[PDB]
Amino acid sequence: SRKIAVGIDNESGGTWTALNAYFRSGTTDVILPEFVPNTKALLYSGRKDTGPVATGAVAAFAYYMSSGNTLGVMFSVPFDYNWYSNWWDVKIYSGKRRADQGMYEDLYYGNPYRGDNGWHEKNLGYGLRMKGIMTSAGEAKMQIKISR
Amino acid sequence: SRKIAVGIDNESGGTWTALNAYFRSGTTDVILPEFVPNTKALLYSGRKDTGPVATGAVAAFAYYMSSGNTLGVMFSVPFDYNWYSNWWDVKIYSGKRRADQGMYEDLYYGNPYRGDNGWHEKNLGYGLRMKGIMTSAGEAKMQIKISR
Amino acid sequence: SRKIAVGIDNESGGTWTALNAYFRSGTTDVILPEFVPNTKALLYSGRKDTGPVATGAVAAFAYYMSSGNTLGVMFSVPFDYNWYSNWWDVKIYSGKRRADQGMYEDLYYGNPYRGDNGWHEKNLGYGLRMKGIMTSAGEAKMQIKISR
Amino acid sequence: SRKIAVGIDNESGGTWTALNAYFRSGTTDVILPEFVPNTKALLYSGRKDTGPVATGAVAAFAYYMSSGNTLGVMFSVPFDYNWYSNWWDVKIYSGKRRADQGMYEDLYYGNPYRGDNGWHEKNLGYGLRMKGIMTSAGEAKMQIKISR
Amino acid sequence: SRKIAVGIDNESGGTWTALNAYFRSGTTDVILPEFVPNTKALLYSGRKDTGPVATGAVAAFAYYMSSGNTLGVMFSVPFDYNWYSNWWDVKIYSGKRRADQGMYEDLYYGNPYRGDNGWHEKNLGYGLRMKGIMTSAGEAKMQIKISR
Amino acid sequence: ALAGTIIAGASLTFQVLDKVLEELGKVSRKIAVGIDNESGGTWTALNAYFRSGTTDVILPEFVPNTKALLYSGRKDTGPVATGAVAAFAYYMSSGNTLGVMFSVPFDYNWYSNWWDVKIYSGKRRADQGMYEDLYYGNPYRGDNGWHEKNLGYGLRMKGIMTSAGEAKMQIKISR
C-alpha cells in the first residue's frame, strides 16, 4: 500500500497556475488543481499502480506562480526499501518550465531531502522559500510551506 | 478495471446540446446529458464491458454549441497497456456533426493528446480553445476546459 | 500490532517550532505539527510498519522552544515484550539540536522512564519541567505535560 | 476475553492526582486521569494482554489525594476462573506510596473483597470512607464511592 | 443465549439502598445500581457465563427499604429447559439482610412464582406489596411494581 | 408508540395494527394484538396463559374508555417447531372477565389460523381451559375477515386477523 498526500501552501502574494504532473513511476487518482490562489492551500495525491508490480510511485509536478517562474516539486514512495529510499525535493525554475523526465532527474539527483520525517528548509530564490516534510511510511504524507 | 468520469467546462459562450455518445470501446451507466448551460459543468462517465472481455474503453462525443458548430471530443483508456496507452483529443466539427466513427479515426488517429496527465492548451478555432488533462491510470478522470 | 499516540502540552508560554522526528524503527500516519502555541497540547501518533516484519515502534522527536532551546521527546514501543519493554523520556538540548540516531540512543540509554503506566516528574531545566506517561500496552497512548 | 473498568467517586474534600498504575499482568489502553477533582468521578479501564496469553488483567494503581496520603486501589480479573476468582480492594497508605509488586500483593493478599457483585463498606480511615462494588463477570466493572 | 433485564419501581415512599447481588451461576455486565429513590424505576440485567459451559444465569439480590427493611428478588433462567424451568420470587426480609446462598435458597425453594408471562400478586407485608411477571423464555423480563 | 401503550379507540386502526405488527421484528409466526375499548369500563390485566408461543410486551394494566390497547407476539426461539398459539384473559371494570384466544400455528398444512373472544363468567384467569374452550366453542378461522359475536353481559365483539402467520388483532368490543 503505497500512496502519497501532497499539500502545498501559497503565501507569496500571487496566483498559482497548473502546468502539469510528470510520472516516472506510479499514478494518481485525483486531477491536480488548476489554481491555488494566494493565502490558499493545495491538495494532491498519488498511489502505487494497480497490479502486483514491484515498482514505486515516483513523480513530480510543475506549478506556475504569478511571479513568472515555476516550482519543481517531487516525491518518491518506493515499493522496495532494500535499495530505494523515499525522497522529496523543491526547486523554483525560472520561466514556465514543464515537469517532465528531466525535471525529476534534476530534482532527484541534485539535493533531494531525505524522507526522514524531518522538516527541511531552504531558500528557493526569487524571493521565495520552502518549508516541507514527507513521512517515511509506506503510505506517505507530504506538506510544503512556501514562504516569501 | 478502467472506469472513466469526464467533466468539461462550458465557458464557450454557448449552451451545448448533447447529440449522441458514440462508444468505440466500452460502455456507460449514465445517459449523455442533453443540456450544458453556460457557466456550468458537464459530467459523463464510461467503463469497460462487464465480464472478462479483452476490449478497451474508447468513446467519441459530440455537442452542439450555440455558435453553430459541434465539439468533437473522444477518450481512450486501453484494456492492454502492453501495446497502447491513454489518449484523448478535442476538436470542433463544422455545423451539425454527430459523434460516430468519424471523429474517432480523425482524432485518435490524427493528433491525439497523450493521456500522460498533462495540461494541454490549443486554439480549437471559431474563437474557442480547450484546456484538458487526464491521468494515465486505468481508473482515470479528466477535466477539459472550453472557453471563448 | 504496535502503535502509540503522542501528546505534549505546551504550558511554557512560547510556541514550539517543529524540528524533525527521527525514527529508529516504525513510521507514522501523521506529520509533526509545525507549530505548538502556548496553552495548546500537541497531538501526534506513531505506528508499526506494514508487513510481518520484526520492526518496532521506537522513535525520538524534538521541538524548538521559543526560548531558543530544543526540547526532545523519545518513546519506545517494541514488538516483542519478551526481550524488551516500553520506554519514554524527555531531555532538553540547548540551542537548535536535531533529532537523530544520537538523540534516540542517548534518550533510550540515559535515564528513560519506564512505560509502566506510571507518572514521572523531573524538572527538565531551563525553567521547564515535564509531567508525562505512556501505557505499557503495545497500542499505547503517550501524554506529556511540560510545565514552566 | 477479560475486561475491567474502573470508576471512582471522589468526595474526599480535596483534589486527587494520579501516581501510577502497576500491572502484574494485563495493560490499559487509557491514561490514568492526572486529576480527579472533588465531587467528580474517576474514569479508568484495563484489559488482559492481547494475544494467546493465559494471564488475566491483575493489577493495581496508586492514586494521590490532596489530603497528603495515597489511595491504593487494586483489581483482579483472572483468565482461568476455575482456579482463580475475581477480587478487589482499596487501602490507604501514609504519605506518597507507589503501586508496585509489593503494593499489588498487599492489596491482593490482605483482606480484598470478593468479586461478589455486592457492595462493600469499611472505614478506610483518614477521614475517608469507601463504598464499592465490582462484578464477578470476566468483563467486570468497578465503582467506588469515596466519601467522608 | 441466557439473559434477563430486571426492573423494579419504588412506590414505597422512600429511597431503596442496594445491598448486594448473590450469584450461584451467571453474572451481570452492568453494576447493580446503588440506589432506587422513591417514584423511580430501577434497571438491572444479567447474562449467562462466557464460553461453552452448560450453565444458566441463576442469582438473587437485595435492597434496603428506607422504612427499615430489606427486599430481595430471585430470578432463575436455566440453560437446560429439558429439565429445569424459569422461576422467580420476592419477599421482604426483616431489617438489613444480605442476599447470599441462604437468601436464594429461601427464595427459590420458597414457593417461586411461575413466570409463564402471567402476573404474580401477593402482599409482601410491612405495608408493602409486590407485583411482577416474566416470560418463560431464555430472555425474560423482570418488572416489579412494589406498592404500598 | 409501543405495544402496550394505550391509544384512543378510534386510533386503533389497521394502519397502527400493521405498524405494531412489524414493530416487534419479522418472524414467520408473529401476532399483533390490539382491542378496541368501547366496553364501558377500564380493562384490567389478568394474565396471559401460553400453552405455546411467547411475546415481549406486557398486558396493558389499564385500558381506559375510548382508549384501545396495543400488544404484539412472536414465535418461540428455540429447537421446537411450534406456533404462537396461546390466549389471555382480560377483565373489564364492569365486573367480568374478557377472554380472548388467538391461534396462529407454525404449520398451516395441518392446523389453521383460529381465534375467539368470549366473556367468561366471574374472575376467570387465563389458563389451558380458557384457550381450549375458546378454540372448541366456535373458533373463528383466519379468513382475513371479520367475525361478530354477542359477548353477553351487555357486550359484543368485532375482530379479525390475517390468514397467514402474520396475525393481527384489531378487535372492536362494543355494547
PDB file of N, CA and C in Angstrom, chain E residues 116-120 131 133 135-137 139 141 145, chain F residues 45-48 54-59 61 71 125:
ATOM      1  N   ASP E 116     -44.768 -17.547  33.686  1.00  0.00           N
ATOM      2  CA  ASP E 116     -45.338 -18.001  32.421  1.00  0.00           C
ATOM      3  C   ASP E 116     -45.906 -16.839  31.614  1.00  0.00           C
ATOM      4  N   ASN E 117     -45.287 -15.657  31.744  1.00  0.00           N
ATOM      5  CA  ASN E 117     -45.855 -14.370  31.310  1.00  0.00           C
ATOM      6  C   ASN E 117     -47.266 -14.215  31.879  1.00  0.00           C
ATOM      7  N   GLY E 118     -47.369 -14.252  33.194  1.00  0.00           N
ATOM      8  CA  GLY E 118     -48.626 -14.009  33.889  1.00  0.00           C
ATOM      9  C   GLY E 118     -48.370 -13.340  35.223  1.00  0.00           C
ATOM     10  N   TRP E 119     -49.197 -12.350  35.551  1.00  0.00           N
ATOM     11  CA  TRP E 119     -48.926 -11.535  36.724  1.00  0.00           C
ATOM     12  C   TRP E 119     -48.927 -12.384  37.995  1.00  0.00           C
ATOM     13  N   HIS E 120     -48.069 -12.000  38.940  1.00  0.00           N
ATOM     14  CA  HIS E 120     -47.954 -12.644  40.241  1.00  0.00           C
ATOM     15  C   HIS E 120     -48.204 -11.612  41.327  1.00  0.00           C
ATOM     16  N   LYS E 131     -45.661  -6.753  42.720  1.00  0.00           N
ATOM     17  CA  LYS E 131     -46.428  -7.087  41.522  1.00  0.00           C
ATOM     18  C   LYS E 131     -45.438  -7.284  40.380  1.00  0.00           C
ATOM     19  N   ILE E 133     -43.784 -10.104  36.990  1.00  0.00           N
ATOM     20  CA  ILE E 133     -44.070 -11.048  35.913  1.00  0.00           C
ATOM     21  C   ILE E 133     -42.818 -11.258  35.065  1.00  0.00           C
ATOM     22  N   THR E 135     -41.439 -13.726  31.316  1.00  0.00           N
ATOM     23  CA  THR E 135     -41.633 -14.765  30.319  1.00  0.00           C
ATOM     24  C   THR E 135     -40.873 -16.021  30.723  1.00  0.00           C
ATOM     25  N   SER E 136     -41.221 -17.137  30.083  1.00  0.00           N
ATOM     26  CA  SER E 136     -40.551 -18.402  30.355  1.00  0.00           C
ATOM     27  C   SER E 136     -39.371 -18.665  29.429  1.00  0.00           C
ATOM     28  N   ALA E 137     -39.105 -17.780  28.474  1.00  0.00           N
ATOM     29  CA  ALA E 137     -38.010 -17.992  27.542  1.00  0.00           C
ATOM     30  C   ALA E 137     -36.671 -17.667  28.198  1.00  0.00           C
ATOM     31  N   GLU E 139     -34.665 -15.404  27.429  1.00  0.00           N
ATOM     32  CA  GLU E 139     -34.533 -13.952  27.543  1.00  0.00           C
ATOM     33  C   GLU E 139     -35.854 -13.436  28.105  1.00  0.00           C
ATOM     34  N   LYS E 141     -38.093 -10.941  31.080  1.00  0.00           N
ATOM     35  CA  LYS E 141     -38.146  -9.583  31.597  1.00  0.00           C
ATOM     36  C   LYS E 141     -38.649  -9.607  33.034  1.00  0.00           C
ATOM     37  N   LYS E 145     -43.625  -3.977  40.423  1.00  0.00           N
ATOM     38  CA  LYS E 145     -44.223  -2.756  40.944  1.00  0.00           C
ATOM     39  C   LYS E 145     -44.489  -2.958  42.431  1.00  0.00           C
TER      40      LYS E 145
ATOM     41  N   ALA F  45     -55.455  -6.072  33.518  1.00  0.00           N
ATOM     42  CA  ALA F  45     -54.621  -7.177  33.062  1.00  0.00           C
ATOM     43  C   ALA F  45     -54.703  -8.367  34.009  1.00  0.00           C
ATOM     44  N   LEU F  46     -55.338  -9.452  33.563  1.00  0.00           N
ATOM     45  CA  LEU F  46     -55.426 -10.653  34.392  1.00  0.00           C
ATOM     46  C   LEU F  46     -54.155 -11.488  34.271  1.00  0.00           C
ATOM     47  N   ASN F  47     -53.909 -12.036  33.080  1.00  0.00           N
ATOM     48  CA  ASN F  47     -52.724 -12.841  32.805  1.00  0.00           C
ATOM     49  C   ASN F  47     -52.688 -13.237  31.337  1.00  0.00           C
ATOM     50  N   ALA F  48     -51.647 -13.968  30.936  1.00  0.00           N
ATOM     51  CA  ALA F  48     -51.513 -14.458  29.562  1.00  0.00           C
ATOM     52  C   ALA F  48     -50.994 -15.894  29.619  1.00  0.00           C
ATOM     53  N   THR F  54     -44.720 -17.182  22.612  1.00  0.00           N
ATOM     54  CA  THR F  54     -44.147 -16.246  23.572  1.00  0.00           C
ATOM     55  C   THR F  54     -44.395 -14.829  23.067  1.00  0.00           C
ATOM     56  N   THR F  55     -43.930 -13.851  23.841  1.00  0.00           N
ATOM     57  CA  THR F  55     -44.048 -12.454  23.447  1.00  0.00           C
ATOM     58  C   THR F  55     -43.077 -11.619  24.267  1.00  0.00           C
ATOM     59  N   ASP F  56     -42.943 -10.355  23.868  1.00  0.00           N
ATOM     60  CA  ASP F  56     -42.034  -9.415  24.505  1.00  0.00           C
ATOM     61  C   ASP F  56     -42.774  -8.431  25.402  1.00  0.00           C
ATOM     62  N   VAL F  57     -43.974  -8.006  25.023  1.00  0.00           N
ATOM     63  CA  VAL F  57     -44.649  -6.898  25.676  1.00  0.00           C
ATOM     64  C   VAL F  57     -45.637  -7.440  26.706  1.00  0.00           C
ATOM     65  N   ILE F  58     -46.119  -6.541  27.559  1.00  0.00           N
ATOM     66  CA  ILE F  58     -46.869  -6.893  28.757  1.00  0.00           C
ATOM     67  C   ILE F  58     -48.323  -6.486  28.547  1.00  0.00           C
ATOM     68  N   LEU F  59     -49.230  -7.239  29.163  1.00  0.00           N
ATOM     69  CA  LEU F  59     -50.643  -6.903  29.142  1.00  0.00           C
ATOM     70  C   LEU F  59     -50.845  -5.467  29.620  1.00  0.00           C
ATOM     71  N   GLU F  61     -52.135  -2.844  31.731  1.00  0.00           N
ATOM     72  CA  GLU F  61     -52.796  -2.928  33.030  1.00  0.00           C
ATOM     73  C   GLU F  61     -54.104  -2.150  33.045  1.00  0.00           C
ATOM     74  N   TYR F  71     -50.398  -4.478  21.678  1.00  0.00           N
ATOM     75  CA  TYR F  71     -49.743  -5.711  22.102  1.00  0.00           C
ATOM     76  C   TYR F  71     -49.228  -6.426  20.861  1.00  0.00           C
ATOM     77  N   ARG F 125     -59.252 -16.347  35.314  1.00  0.00           N
ATOM     78  CA  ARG F 125     -57.863 -16.225  34.898  1.00  0.00           C
ATOM     79  C   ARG F 125     -57.599 -17.091  33.672  1.00  0.00           C
TER      80      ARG F 125
END
